[PDB]
Structure formats: C-alpha cells, structure tokens
Design a protein around this ligand. Structure first.
Ligand SMILES: C[C@@H]1O[C@@H](O[C@@H]2[C@H](O)[C@@H](O)[C@@H](O[C@H]3[C@H](O[C@@H]4[C@H](O)[C@@H](O)[C@@H](O[C@H]5[C@H](O[C@@H]6[C@H](O)[C@@H](O)[C@@H](O)O[C@@H]6C(=O)O)O[C@@H](C)[C@H](O)[C@H]5O)O[C@@H]4C(=O)O)O[C@@H](C)[C@H](O)[C@H]3O)O[C@@H]2C(=O)O)[C@H](O)[C@H](O)[C@H]1O
Ligand SMILES: [Ca+2]
Length: 508
C-alpha cells in the first residue's frame, strides 16, 4: 500500500508503483539505505544514497498529503526533500541550501548495485573506471589500455534532461528539468554517472568547482526526479508542479513566475542559437527556433543579464526584467565582426569543434592511444584539414603551433591575427610570432582552479587574443605564424599550462 512505515531508526516509503518501489530513509542521517524495485534490492549496502557523502545527522519527518508522501531532512544550512506520488516509481527530490556545503560542491549521489546496474547511459563504459588504475589525480583511470573518468559521462546542462544507469532487468534515470539554481550557464557539464568498481554511481551535480565560471546560487535546487524502470526508458516529461502544495522552502510555483519571449537575429545560421538569462538568484536558457524565435522557461521575477549565442559564442548581451504572470517581449540581435579574411581556422562557435581530437576529448583522456598525435604539427593553410589542427596546445606537449599560409601582394597591409580560445589551464595563453615579428605577451587569464581538458571539458571563459600585425610584415608568398602558449607555471604533459582553441582568424 501507498504509505509510510515507521521504526525507531527509519521511515520506509512505499510509492505503490505497479512494479513496486519502496525505499528506506534513515531517521538519523537521511541516507537512503535500501531501495526495493520489483522485489530487488538496488541500494549499495556499505554507503547510503544521499547529498554529497552524507548529511551525517538530520532532523527527519515524513508526512502524507493526499496522494503524495513528503520526507523532509533538516540540517543547519541544507534541507533535503523527497516526494513520491501514489502509483509512480519515482523519487522526486529538491535541495534547499542557505549556504554552499563545506565540500564546495552540491551533488546528489545514488550508490546502486553495479551487478544489476552495470551500464551507463547515454555514453556507455567511458565513465566505467572499475578495475582502473589512476593516471591523473584519483579521477582518471586506465582500464586495460583505455582511459576512463566519471567526467566522460558529462553533458552540457542544456542537453542533459536525462541520464541513467541500467542492466537487463532494471534502469534508474535522473530526470532534470530545473537547472535554475546551478552555476556555469547552459554549456556547463558535470559528472553524471560512474561505475567505479564497488557500485554504479548516478548523480546530479547541482553545482561544483569542475570548470566553474560562476558564483554558487542559494535557495531551492531542482526539483529533480530519480525514476525506476524494469526495461522501459522514462520520458523526460515529468510533472513536478505538485511541489507547490507541499510547503517546499525556496519553491516558487508557476504563478510566481514570468517569461521573456522574442526573436534573436543576425548570428551565424549554420549554428544552433541559444538565449541565456542569469542573475545571482537564477539562470535560465533556451534554444531558439531556426527563425530565431524563443520563449524562456518559467522564470523567477527580477532583472537578468540576457545573452545570445551562436553555438557557445556570445554575439550580444542585454538586460531584461521579469514580472510574475506576464511575458516580457524582448528581441536580441548581433553578429561576430572581424574583417576581410585572409584565412580562418575553425568557426566562431565557442567550441574546439572540428579540430584534431575534439570529439575524442569529451569521452577520453588526451594520453589515450586512440587520440591522434598532438604534435607539434605544422598546419599549412590550403593543404591541411581542420582535423590536422590541434584542439589544444600544451606548453609541454605540442608547443608551439606552427601555421603556414600563402598571401598575395594585395594582402600585405595591416592585419589582426585573432586567437580565440574556450578554456585555459595553469595560466595558459598564446603569444604569436608572424614571420620575424613578435606580438606582446598577454597577462595571465583568470584561474578557474580546475582541470578541464583532461576531464572532458572545454567551456571556460572564452578568452580572445588579438595581435596587431603592421603593414608589410605579411609578405607575398609563404608566411609563418608561431603560436606559443606562455605561462609562469609548470606541469607534466597534459597538466602543463594550456588552452583549448576556438577559432584562429587572420583578417584585414
Ligand atoms: C591532478 C590533481 O589536480 C588537482 O586537483 C584538484 C583537487 O585536489 C582534486 O581533488 C579534484 O577536485 C575536484 C573533486 O571532484 C570530484 C567529485 O566532485 C568529488 O566529490 C570527489 O569525489 C570522490 C568522492 O569521495 C569521497 C571522498 O572524497 C573519498 O575520500 C572517500 O571518503 O569517499 C567519499 C565518497 O563520497 O564516497 O565521491 C566519490 C563518490 C567519488 O568516487 C570520489 O572520486 O572527487 C572528484 C575528483 O574529481 O577527484 O573534488 C571536489 C571536492 C573538488 O571541489 C573538485 O575541485 O580536482 C581538482 C582540480 O582539478 O583542480 C590538484 O593539483 C591535485 O593535487 C592533483 O592530484
Ligand atoms: Ca570553434
């Protein structure tokens, strides 16, 4: 039956789902210590499923409100909520914080039986580190001859409404339709799952210091939903609006929200367009249609910075105010301006898209034998393919990048060499030589104090480095550009100072 079974040490919540879902919540710690789905225990028995590594101690209450059961766990700065609906094999959750946890990240982790749930979806065994030997920190492993990381399960938050772990008789998915309290914007990615040897971990990283570009946000994180299937795959259309009736702290209901609608225009139409709104309280985003039309998700009232991307490259920024119960009509337009192009390597999309190893980097370590050579490589404009240009240059792996290009006598005037990047590590930034002419050393970029390129990430601050080339420095015939990554810092191989490339353009 749908209901709560109480003992001194626990509440057993029964969702009354057709294929059975009961779970045990510790009244002392708020740990999920047992999960029975279709007569089968799914929960790792040594460690609970919980926020972080455990709340440790919490004040726990359970109540029925009609066809809903709510479990509340209170700590000093964090309230954890679990809500179930009669008939549904889902643990709905929401996490209310007034401060960032001590550890400096906010995650939920489900620690589940890896024999029954060995697989990871949608990306496969790339995040299975079981039987792996660490090759970097304690988060990148070698399994046989293949490199592996929990990070290789990651996905841009804008595209991460569902990820799961699974076996032949059970599937457990995270359903994620509310990223408003997270940090890093639409292109932030994070750890999703990890079969690490003892159990298979399923996550939602509400926030983290993994390639973090923003301050943390307080208030209610989620709702998020952990779905339990036999062999089905749950839709991402899961109604959580019943949270409005359960006095969830920090919860703002539909009627407390407003929107922004309009049309974005002017950007590169070969790319997906994204509109992004943020302030200290909340962040929202949406893809636009191919005509540029957009309607924001339901937004908390307030004033927001509004950004228009082609790919992950901001072409315009603006400000907008949202009122509860109304739609603010707000258009946005803009484009990337350069000049008359001599050559262009890659595209202005805020990604290493198309470069050598770009597709692999998301799902493996740069040391992986399946990677193509890092170089040093000479890219000759007109003969070399884009997949011959390294996605990253490391001070101590493939430094420098040499570019060969032909110019006509009509192209010997003043130019700007533009070096567009996505993300830096250890102070990495480019200094350019063109023929016998050396550009200035730019100052160190902001340090994000995080590995990235070795952990499947590329979305950083997107620094752009322009070099003014005087007239008559470019010559008719062959020319040479040397891109050196400079930095006062030092490191072994892929942890040496580096940056990931976005686009390299020479224009007049
Ligand atoms: C090469 C490396 O580079 C630099 O590294 C720093 C930093 O020193 C390093 O720890 C790493 O930090 C990030 C990291 O993020 C990951 C997870 O989000 C985090 O929860 C953690 O996960 C582990 C965790 O285990 C718990 C506990 O830590 C264990 O000791 C044990 O008790 O079990 C606990 C448990 O909950 O089970 O959770 C497990 C489920 C998981 O399996 C564990 O991996 O670590 C992850 C990781 O990537 O290592 O940790 C958080 C707290 C931090 O905020 C992140 O920055 O990466 C940093 C960086 O990239 O800069 C340093 O130079 C370092 O010395 C060097 O070795
Ligand atoms: Ca690019």
């Amino acid at each position: 039956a749908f209901g709560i079974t109480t003992s001194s040490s626990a509440y057993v919540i029964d969702t009354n789902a057709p294929n059975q879902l009961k779970f045990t919540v510790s009244r002392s710690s708020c740990d999920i210590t047992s999960i029975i789905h279709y007569g089968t225990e799914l929960q790792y028995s040594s460690q609970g499923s919980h926020i972080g590594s455990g709340l440790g101690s919490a004040t726990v209450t359970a109540t029925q409100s009609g066809d809903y059961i709510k479990v509340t766990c209170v700590t000093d700065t964090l309230t954890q909520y679990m809500v179930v609906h009669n008939g549904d094999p889902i643990i709905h959750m929401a996490t209310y914080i007034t401060a960032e946890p001590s550890i400096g990240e906010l995650r939920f982790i489900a620690r589940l039986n890896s024999d029954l749930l060995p697989n990871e979806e949608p990306f496969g065994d790339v995040s299975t580190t079981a039987d792996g030997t660490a090759i970097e920190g304690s988060d990148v492993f070698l399994v046989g001859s293949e490199t592996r990381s929990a990070f290789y399960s990651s996905e841009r938050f804008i595209d991460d409404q569902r990820h799961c772990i699974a076996g032949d008789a059970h599937r457990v998915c995270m359903i994620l339709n509310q990223y408003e309290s997270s940090s890093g914007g639409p292109f932030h990615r994070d750890i999703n799952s990890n079969n690490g040897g003892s159990y298979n971990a399923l996550y939602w990283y509400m926030n983290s210091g993994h390639v973090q570009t923003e301050s943390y946000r307080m208030g209610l994180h989620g709702p998020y939903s952990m779905y339990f299937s036999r062999s089905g795959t749950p839709s991402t259309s899961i109604d959580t609006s019943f949270f409005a009736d359960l006095d969830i702290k920090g919860y703002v209901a539909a009627s407390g929200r407003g929107k922004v609608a309009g049309t974005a225009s002017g950007a590169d139409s070969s790319m997906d367009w994204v509109v992004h709104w943020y302030n200290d309280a909340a962040q929202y985003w949406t893809y636009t249609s191919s005509s540029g039309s957009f309607t924001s998700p339901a937004m908390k009232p307030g004033t927001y910075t509004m950004v228009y991307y082609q790919g992950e490259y901001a072409v315009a920024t603006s400000s907008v105010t949202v009122s509860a119960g109304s739609t603010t009509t707000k258009n946005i337009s803009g484009s990337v301006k350069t000049g008359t192009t001599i050559f262009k390597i890659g595209e202005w999309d805020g990604q290493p898209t198309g470069f050598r190893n770009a597709a692999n980097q998301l799902r493996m370590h740069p040391s992986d034998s399946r990677m193509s050579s890092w170089g040093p490589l000479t890219y000759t404009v007109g003969s070399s393919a884009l997949t011959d240009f390294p996605m990253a240059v490391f001070k101590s792996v493939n430094n420098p990048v040499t570019i060969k290009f032909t110019a006509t006598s009509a192209q010997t005037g003043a130019a700007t060499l533009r070096i567009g990047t996505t993300l830096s590590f250890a102070g990495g930034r480019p200094q350019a030589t063109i023929n016998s002419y050396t550009g200035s050393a730019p100052a160190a970029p902001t340090n994000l104090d995080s590995r990235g390129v070795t952990r499947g990430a590329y979305r950083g601050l997107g620094e752009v480095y322009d070099v003014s080339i005087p007239s008559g420095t470019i010559v008719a015939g062959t020319n040479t550009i040397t891109i050196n990554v400079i930095s006062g810092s030092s490191g072994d191989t892929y942890l040496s100072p580096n940056f990931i490339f976005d686009c390299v353009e020479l224009f007049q």
